[PDB]
Amino acid sequence: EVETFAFQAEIAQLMSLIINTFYSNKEIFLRELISNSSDALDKIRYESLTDPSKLDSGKELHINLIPNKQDRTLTIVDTGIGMTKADLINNLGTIAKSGTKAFMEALQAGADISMIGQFGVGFYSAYLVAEKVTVITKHNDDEQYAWESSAGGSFTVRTDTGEPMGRGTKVILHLKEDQTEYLEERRIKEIVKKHSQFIGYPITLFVEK
Ligand SMILES: COc1ccc(Cl)cc1NC(N)=S
């Protein structure tokens, strides 16, 4: 059972800008997604200090980067706090509305796309390199969900029947045809070393068979 939702007009406008603006420094998408993963891991770690049972869904706190050339996907997996259905539909969109407004004002003032993360909407930098983004997520207080959007103003949410994740978030980037450099081990290593060297969780770059 698949539910389809309209983005708020402001978020749709942000995604069109990210997809249509000429901007060569696309590699920042990975810094933004790793930063999001790190924040989600910080959140479950802090919550576990006062409620250790919050880690019953998994004690390991880590980030995995998984390229797949056959499917042309780059997957960023974290075992962070995860997202509820309400997060996916309502709460994140509310935060993203004000962040988008601010980011658009800054861009017109002369900022560039690489400061997107300062405005809380760095997730959408995924559309610099992905034609479709799928997000599988599991929060301790909710079911496992799959969120998906190819932009165009709408996204879907369904209950996920895939492999149970325990807790956390999987961002699956279905890469644009001309962005397959981000499936290359040496390219991902280069980007992580440049932008994410001090993230406080182990980042494992999987290699391909
Ligand atoms: C996975 O969904 C999101 C991820 C990041 C942000 Cl900032 C917002 C959303 N959601 C919306 N409904 S706009």
Domain boundaries, the chain: 2-205
From the alpha carbon of 92, which atom of ligand 1 is closest?
8
From the alpha carbon of 133, which atom of ligand 1 is closest?
1
119 is in an annotated binding site: no
Pocket of ligand 1 (CB under 6 A): 7, 11, 88-89, 92-93, 96, 121, 123, 135, 147
The answer to whether 81 touches 44, Cβ cutoff 8 Å, is yes
CA-wise closest residue to 8 among 100, 136, 71 = 100
CA-wise closest residue to 7 among 116, 156, 146, 119 = 156
CA-wise closest residue to 33 among 135, 101, 152 = 135
Instruction: Give the list of residues 6+ apart from residue 202 with CB closer than 8 angstroms, or none.
Output: 62, 63
64 is in an annotated binding site: no
The answer to whether 135 touches 170, Cβ cutoff 8 Å, is yes
CATH number of 2-205: 3.30.565.10
Q: What is the resolution of this structure in A?
A: 1.7
Buried residues in 71-93 as b, exposed as e (16+ CB within 10 A): ebbbbbbbbbbbbbbebbbeebb
Distances (CA, A) of 112 to 103, 104, 170: 9, 10, 27
Site of tokens 């983004």 = 133
As a whole number of angstroms, the distance between CA 137 and CA 126 comes to 16
Using DSSP, state whether 135 is helix, strand or coil.
Answer: strand
CA end-to-end span of the chain: 34
CA-wise closest residue to 13 among 101, 110, 93, 89 = 101
97 is in an annotated binding site: yes
